[PDB]
Amino acid sequence: GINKVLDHLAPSELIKPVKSCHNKPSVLVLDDRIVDAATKDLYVNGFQQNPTPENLQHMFHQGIEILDSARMINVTHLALWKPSSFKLGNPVDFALDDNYDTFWQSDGGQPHQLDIMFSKRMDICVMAIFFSMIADESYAPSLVKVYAGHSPSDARFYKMLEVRNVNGWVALRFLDNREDDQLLKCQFIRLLFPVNHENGKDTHLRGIRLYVPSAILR
Amino acid sequence: SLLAYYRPTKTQFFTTKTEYAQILAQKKYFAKIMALRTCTNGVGWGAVAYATEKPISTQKWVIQPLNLISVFPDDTKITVKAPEDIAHDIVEWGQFHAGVSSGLRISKKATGITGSWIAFNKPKELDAYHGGFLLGLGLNGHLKNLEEWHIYNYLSPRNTHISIGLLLGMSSSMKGSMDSKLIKVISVHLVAFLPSGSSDLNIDLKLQTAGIIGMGMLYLNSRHKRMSDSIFAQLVSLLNVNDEMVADEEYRLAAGISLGLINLGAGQTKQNVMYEDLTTKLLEIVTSTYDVENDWIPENSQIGAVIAIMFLFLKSNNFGISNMLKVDLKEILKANINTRPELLMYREWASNMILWEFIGDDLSFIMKDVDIGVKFSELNTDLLPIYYTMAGRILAMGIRFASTGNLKIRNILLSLVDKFLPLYQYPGKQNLDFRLTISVINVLTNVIVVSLSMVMCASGDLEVLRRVKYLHEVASGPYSDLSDPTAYLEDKKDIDDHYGKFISTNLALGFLFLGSGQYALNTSTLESIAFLSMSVLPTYTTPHPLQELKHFWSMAVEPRCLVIKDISTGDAVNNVPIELVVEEDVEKEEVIREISTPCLLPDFSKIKSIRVKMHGYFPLEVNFTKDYSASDFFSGGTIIYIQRKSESVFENKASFRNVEDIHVALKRKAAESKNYSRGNTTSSQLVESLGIQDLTMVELDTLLSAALTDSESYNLGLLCSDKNSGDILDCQLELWYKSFGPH
């Protein structure tokens, strides 16, 4: 029994099929001009001239309630946040306030970092980010890389995000890491914004949310 | 040859492709990887050469600069340049490591190393080498009282490495004298301990971590309240860098080891009120569960708290404290679990060391209460805690049996490393759940090889060397076979992973051959385990926190090499069998251990008697009673001398008491003929030719020459009737000749 469990913890010859990984970082396509079942799963607001900001503020809301319509638990306020640097105008609260009009702006080095470090082990399943190509083209996030890990020590690359044209909420559920669980299990998540559109300098963040699974009297 | 650094390094490359440009890229990648190896050979070279070279004082020291140039079997040399090929910080970090090894190479007892000597050896241009050299001398215990004249000269530049070297080395030389003129230097250096409200002065964070560890190790066994409470606040509080609040895991780990070392051995209490208050405060830190992350008590302080509760109750055998530190796998695997999983390995390693009597030597102790208990046997994040469970238990297992040697533990570690080796650095399905799990596999396999090297220390074992050679060579990883800043960071993660994978195998290589194999670690004195435990800290993951502390096992290294010398000649004699009496590391009675002459005997306190037996020199056997230990007997020196037996003609007057076995006689004649190949030329032959071999017979023949007075007549008769003697019949037969022979 001692040997057989050690083999289960340490499967030597069972696991490695051929050792022939491509080792390239997989790139995720975010374009909203092509209609597909997989894209519809990750892109919620639906594929569509540029809408006026009031439609953008409008569509900002149904994307919120549609994401909140399904059976889901929001723990966006259940963790500590620490961006790369402030600009003394708007902290990350205006990014997490679920308001399109308000937003958070960083100011500092070009590779901006946004830290989302958790207190307890919570298994995140759906990653929600809102982008506004036309409202914030100057500070639009063009290049996104999401990390994963159990601590600031062991942060590791998870996924690639190239931004070409997204005016809407982006849903990011995780299936590569665990096909059995269809969710991500980490305590430490950090985001990098190394470059913006049309060679931008700084970057806003209109919306951000975190999703995990599990008449009246006054 | 495998560990040497001051030379081009031999490389082997897979390059499972045919394209020339692709082959060059992999060779460059391997060159960058081998460049990492050269930087991190500092840990290995320090242990290989501990006290080999001796100083001449007048002679000037020299430090070989890092070569980091790789050579392929094709002999197409590829040379690594900074910062184009590797991270810039890595190259002088390896220089700093090499400097420490060079500084540590000087023996502890060497004299003439005053404050002027280091200034005499100053390169007139501060760099990483001199900072390491400064650390090495202070680490060895030479900077007892360094003059204030050139302390400012060294500290005037804001260079981190030199300041790091000075603070650690200078504190290590004094090591617990609580001197004010030195403690204030760190107090100025540490920003948080500086008076509140003062304008911030730019001090590098790594320098503060260097200052805090030097200062805590300055306060060894002080049990000192007005500093210990300030340290506890320092661990909990928050720091300031670049005018913005920051929380550092490195500093809090440095603070935790600092507090634990200052109050080392202060937990054996049955002062207790404040010790109990500090104990419960630490347990609140380690056991608190926060649904919402508090800013000023993050999980970064968890490691420091565990390593603080580590050293307070070290070797205390307090069951309850271990229990509230020990974590049960059965309960946690059912739950979702909380906190960083890396805390678990520290926590279990904490519990195991508290009970410094129950460290099991069997695989059952390692595998205790572990089961996958799930259908999905694929490598998944859910089963990390058992891996960290494994690492903590084996690390306590290895440190417990440090340098004592064994077979069962070695075989168990051999089986474990054999099983876990193939999985190592295998990015097959690029999945982060898989990637995080196999990163823990890399951490786990780094712990197993280190611990396996720990227990078999200074032995020059074959298979242990065989495995650590494997983990040494071949980068493996994503490349080979088995947006610009982003690719830089993507390459930065892989290059840092290779650096952490190399420091473990290097440390294992050095400990296998410690001090040319004649020096062994100490686990007898209480503080020795403290230095052993701190230096063996696994920080192999990024950003490799607190790396300069790897060169600190040096306090625990000593002789325990035994050799035999002759007295009359005064020269060494070797290759004589030595029988040893030991306790088998258990309560068993005894086992006879036969070893060669230049061999490392076990700990002196566990030895009861030792005897030397060999054909020739007469035997010498000493038994150690309770009154005197082997340590006290060997206190004057680890060498015992033996007296030569004499093959004298006078010894064999008439009869041979010696057995004179045919085989040894033939061996002696062959040995003599070997010298003769390479006769009455010996004075013994002369005295034999004189016919005066029999001392007594000659004397009585002179005496009887003439008489035969009654008194002397009874004297010879008494000699004739002796109870025991030699040529009695010869004496009897002379007196008969004298009495009644021809005349």
- Contact in structure between B507 and B551 (CB atoms under 8 Å): no
Q: B408-420 vs A2-9: helix axis angle to the nearest 10? A: 40
- Residue A70 burial (CB < 10 Å; 0-12/13-18/19+)? exposed
Instruction: Report the half-sphere exposure of B117 (CA within 13 A, side-chain side).
Output: 20
Measured between alpha carbons, how far is residue B146 from residues A195, B134, B152, B154, B570 in Å?
51, 11, 11, 12, 40
Mutate to test the interface with B, among A177, A181, A214 (most CBs of B within 10 A): A177
Structure tokens at B129: 């080498």
DSSP B600: E
Residues near B142 by Cβ (< 8 Å), separated by ≥ 6?
Answer: B106, B110, B113, B173
CB contacts < 8 Å between A and B, how many? 164
Which residues of B fall within a CB distance of 8 Å from A181? 380
Please give the helix or strand (H or E) that residue B333 lies within, else none.
Answer: helix B329-334
- The C-alpha atoms of residue A93 and residue B317 are separated, in whole angstroms, by 49
- Contact in structure between B495 and B226 (CB atoms under 8 Å): no
Phi, psi of B535 (to 5 degrees): -75, -20
- The C-alpha atoms of residue B189 and residue B170 are separated, in whole angstroms, by 14
**Nearest Cβ partner for A150 among B342, B390, B542:** B342
Mutate to test the interface with B, among A153, A183, A188, A196 (most CBs of B within 10 A): A153
Residues near A47 by Cβ (< 8 Å), separated by ≥ 6?
Answer: A32, A33, A34, A35
- The C-alpha atoms of residue B6 and residue B68 are separated, in whole angstroms, by 8
Phi, psi of A159 (to 5 degrees): -150, 165
Mutate to test the interface with B, among A73, A119, A160, A162 (most CBs of B within 10 A): A119
Chain-chain contact of A153 with B378 (C-beta, under 8 angstroms) = no
Compare all CA atoms of chain B with the CA of A9 and give the residue at the minimum distance.
Answer: B372
Structure tokens at A147: 């990390």
Q: B272-287 vs B301-312: helix axis angle to the nearest 10? A: 150
**Nearest Cβ partner for B428 among A21, A154, A187:** A21
The dihedral through the CA atoms of B512, B518, B523, B528 has a sign that is: negative
Distance from CA of A178 to the nearest CA of B (A): 6
Instruction: Report the half-sphere exposure of B86 (CA within 13 A, side-chain side).
Output: 28
Please give the helix or strand (H or E) that residue B578 lies within, else none.
Answer: strand B578-582
Nearest CA among B42, B46, B13, B45 for reference residue B30 = B13
- The C-alpha atoms of residue A184 and residue A124 are separated, in whole angstroms, by 5
- Type of residue numbered B287: T
Which DSSP string corresponds to B269-327?
---HHHHHHHHHHHHHHHH---SS--SSS-TTHHHHHHHHHHHHTTT---HHHHHHHS-
Please give the helix or strand (H or E) that residue B334 lies within, else none.
Answer: helix B329-334
User: Contacts by B319-323 with C-beta closer than 8 Å and gap 24+?
Assistant: B319/B355, B321/B267, B321/B279, B321/B354, B322/B350, B322/B351, B322/B352, B322/B354, B322/B355, B323/B351
- The C-alpha atoms of residue B272 and residue B313 are separated, in whole angstroms, by 13
**Nearest Cβ partner for B419 among A12, A16, A192:** A12
- CA B365 to mean position of chain CA atoms: 25
Chain-chain contact of B422 with A80 (C-beta, under 8 angstroms) = no
Nearest CA among B116, B122, B147 for reference residue B134 = B122
- Put simply, the chain B residues between 408 and 437 with a CB less than 8 A from any chain A CB are 416, 418-423, 426-436
Distance from CA of A121 to the nearest CA of B (A): 5
Tally Cβ neighbours within 10 Å of residue A96. Answer: 18
What would the 3-class secondary structure string for chain A be?
A: CHHHHHHHHCCCCCCCCCCCCCCCCCEEECCCCCCCHHHHHHECCCCCCCCCHHHHHHHHHHHHHHHHHCCCEECCCCEEEEECCCCCCCCCHHHHCCCCCCCEECCCCCCEEEEEEECCCCCCCEEEEEECCCCCCCCCECEEEEEEECCCCCCEEEEEEECCCCCEEEEEECCCCCCCCCCCCCCEEEEEECCECCCCCCCEECEEEEEECCCCCC
User: In this complex, is the C-beta atom of B361 within 8 Å of any C-beta atom belonging to chain A?
Assistant: no
The dihedral through the CA atoms of B209, B215, B220, B221 has a sign that is: negative
Alpha helices, DSSP H only, in B402-461?
408-420, 432-455
User: In this complex, is the C-beta atom of B292 within 8 Å of any C-beta atom belonging to chain A?
Assistant: yes
- The C-alpha atoms of residue B625 and residue B604 are separated, in whole angstroms, by 12
Which residues of A fall within a CB distance of 8 Å from B377? 8, 11
Nearest CA among B68, B60, B62 for reference residue B40 = B68
- The C-alpha atoms of residue B726 and residue B694 are separated, in whole angstroms, by 10
Q: How, if at all, do strands B591-595 and B578-582 pair?
A: antiparallel
Chain-chain contact of A121 with B244 (C-beta, under 8 angstroms) = no
Structure tokens at B429: 């399905």
Which residues of A fall within a CB distance of 8 Å from B483? 143, 194-195
Measured between alpha carbons, how far is residue B413 from residues B201, B344, B366, B409, B684 in Å?
49, 21, 10, 6, 60
Distance from CA of A51 to the nearest CA of B (A): 29
**Nearest Cβ partner for B372 among A5, A85, A153:** A5
Tally Cβ neighbours within 10 Å of residue B359. Answer: 16
Tally Cβ neighbours within 10 Å of residue B452. Answer: 26
- Contact in structure between B322 and B351 (CB atoms under 8 Å): yes
Residues near A67 by Cβ (< 8 Å), separated by ≥ 6?
Answer: A44, A126, A128, A169, A171, A209, A211
- Contact in structure between A185 and A178 (CB atoms under 8 Å): yes
> For this experimental structure, what is the resolution in angstroms?
5.4
Compare all CA atoms of chain A with the CA of B420 and give the residue at the minimum distance.
Answer: A10
Nearest CA among A130, A143, A127 for reference residue A99 = A130
B561 forms bridges with which residues in the sheet? B600
Please give the helix or strand (H or E) that residue B591 lies within, else none.
Answer: strand B591-595
- The C-alpha atoms of residue B409 and residue B455 are separated, in whole angstroms, by 8
- Contact in structure between B534 and B261 (CB atoms under 8 Å): yes
User: In this complex, is the C-beta atom of B693 within 8 Å of any C-beta atom belonging to chain A?
Assistant: no
- The C-alpha atoms of residue B209 and residue B303 are separated, in whole angstroms, by 15
Chain-chain contact of B249 with A19 (C-beta, under 8 angstroms) = no
User: In this complex, is the C-beta atom of B363 within 8 Å of any C-beta atom belonging to chain A?
Assistant: yes
DSSP B67: -
Compare all CA atoms of chain A with the CA of B379 and give the residue at the minimum distance.
Answer: A9
Chain-chain contact of B291 with A120 (C-beta, under 8 angstroms) = yes
Mutate to test the interface with A, among B239, B249, B340, B432 (most CBs of A within 10 A): B432
- The C-alpha atoms of residue B263 and residue B283 are separated, in whole angstroms, by 16
Q: Where are the beta strands (DSSP E) in B63-214?
A: 69-71, 78-79
Compare all CA atoms of chain A with the CA of B365 and give the residue at the minimum distance.
Answer: A2
Nearest CA among A159, A175, A195, A84 for reference residue A126 = A175
* Helix, strand, coil share of chain B (percent; to 5): 50, 5, 40
- Contact in structure between B90 and B33 (CB atoms under 8 Å): no
- Type of residue numbered B373: G
- The C-alpha atoms of residue A62 and residue A67 are separated, in whole angstroms, by 8
- Residue B212 burial (CB < 10 Å; 0-12/13-18/19+)? buried
User: In this complex, is the C-beta atom of B492 within 8 Å of any C-beta atom belonging to chain A?
Assistant: no
- Type of residue numbered A201: K
Q: Is the peptide bond before B73 cis (omega within 30 degrees of 0)?
A: no
The dihedral through the CA atoms of B315, B320, B321, B327 has a sign that is: positive
Compare all CA atoms of chain B with the CA of A185 and give the residue at the minimum distance.
Answer: B381
- The C-alpha atoms of residue B652 and residue B693 are separated, in whole angstroms, by 8
- Type of residue numbered B535: S
- Per DSSP, the three-state class of B70 is strand
Chain-chain contact of B340 with A80 (C-beta, under 8 angstroms) = no
Widest CA span in chain A: 68
Compare all CA atoms of chain A with the CA of B16 and give the residue at the minimum distance.
Answer: A20
- Put simply, the chain B residues between 221 and 250 with a CB less than 8 A from any chain A CB are 244, 249
Tokens 């790897």 locate to B550
Nearest CA among B648, B667, B639 for reference residue B574 = B639
- Contact in structure between B405 and B456 (CB atoms under 8 Å): yes
- Contact in structure between A71 and A172 (CB atoms under 8 Å): no
Q: Is the peptide bond before B83 cis (omega within 30 degrees of 0)?
A: yes
Measured between alpha carbons, how far is residue B498 from residues B31, B69, B328, B341, B418 in Å?
12, 17, 33, 22, 21
Please give the helix or strand (H or E) that residue B471 lies within, else none.
Answer: helix B462-472
- The C-alpha atoms of residue B528 and residue B522 are separated, in whole angstroms, by 6
DSSP B202: -
Which residues of B fall within a CB distance of 8 Å from A17? 428
- Contact in structure between B50 and B104 (CB atoms under 8 Å): yes
User: In this complex, is the C-beta atom of B474 within 8 Å of any C-beta atom belonging to chain A?
Assistant: no
Chain-chain contact of B342 with A151 (C-beta, under 8 angstroms) = yes
- Per DSSP, the three-state class of B239 is strand
- Put simply, the chain B residues between 541 and 600 with a CB less than 8 A from any chain A CB are 541-543, 545
Which DSSP string corresponds to B512-574?
HTSGGGT-EE--SSHHHHHHHHHHT----STT-TTGGGGTTGGGGEE--EEEEEESSS--EE-
- The C-alpha atoms of residue B316 and residue B354 are separated, in whole angstroms, by 6
- The C-alpha atoms of residue B622 and residue B432 are separated, in whole angstroms, by 63
Chain-chain contact of A180 with B380 (C-beta, under 8 angstroms) = yes
Tokens 């600069």 locate to B65
Domains of chain A (ranges, CATH numbers):
1-212 (2.60.120.260)
- Residue B677 burial (CB < 10 Å; 0-12/13-18/19+)? exposed
- Residue B74 burial (CB < 10 Å; 0-12/13-18/19+)? exposed
Which residues of A fall within a CB distance of 8 Å from B421? 12
Q: How, if at all, do strands A168-173 and A126-131 pair?
A: antiparallel
- The C-alpha atoms of residue B105 and residue B62 are separated, in whole angstroms, by 12
Alpha helices, DSSP H only, in B361-403?
363-367, 384-400
- The C-alpha atoms of residue B543 and residue B209 are separated, in whole angstroms, by 14
- Per DSSP, the three-state class of B243 is coil
Nearest CA among A193, A69, A88, A205 for reference residue A135 = A205
- The C-alpha atoms of residue B94 and residue B37 are separated, in whole angstroms, by 9
Measured between alpha carbons, how far is residue B195 from residues B191, B316, B421, B715 in Å?
8, 37, 52, 99
Which DSSP string corresponds to B7-41?
SPEE---------HHHHHHHHHHHHHHHHHHHHHH
Tally Cβ neighbours within 10 Å of residue B69. Answer: 16
Tally Cβ neighbours within 10 Å of residue B662. Answer: 8
- Contact in structure between B273 and B294 (CB atoms under 8 Å): no
- The C-alpha atoms of residue B720 and residue B729 are separated, in whole angstroms, by 8
Chain-chain contact of B390 with A194 (C-beta, under 8 angstroms) = no
Structure tokens at B154: 């060294």
User: In this complex, is the C-beta atom of B291 within 8 Å of any C-beta atom belonging to chain A?
Assistant: yes
- Contact in structure between B593 and B580 (CB atoms under 8 Å): yes
Chain-chain contact of A26 with B433 (C-beta, under 8 angstroms) = no
Chain-chain contact of A10 with B423 (C-beta, under 8 angstroms) = yes
Chain-chain contact of B432 with A184 (C-beta, under 8 angstroms) = yes
Distance from CA of B253 to the nearest CA of A (A): 13
Buried/exposed code over A178-190 (b: 16+ C-beta within 10 A; e: otherwise): beebebbbbbbbb
- Type of residue numbered A171: A
Phi, psi of A126 (to 5 degrees): -125, 125
Nearest CA among B246, B485, B244 for reference residue A110 = B485
- Type of residue numbered B3: L
Buried/exposed code over B304-331 (b: 16+ C-beta within 10 A; e: otherwise): bbbbbbbbbbbbbebeebbeebbbebee
Structure tokens at B326: 């020990």
The dihedral through the CA atoms of B63, B186, B275, B177 has a sign that is: positive
- Type of residue numbered A52: T
Structure tokens at A62: 């149904």
Structure tokens at B557: 């290294």
- The C-alpha atoms of residue B9 and residue B79 are separated, in whole angstroms, by 11
Which residues of B fall within a CB distance of 8 Å from A110? 485
Tally Cβ neighbours within 10 Å of residue B730. Answer: 16
- CA B51 to mean position of chain CA atoms: 13
- CA B101 to mean position of chain CA atoms: 14
- Type of residue numbered B450: V
- CA B22 to mean position of chain CA atoms: 42
- The C-alpha atoms of residue B308 and residue B301 are separated, in whole angstroms, by 10
Structure tokens at B342: 């890396």
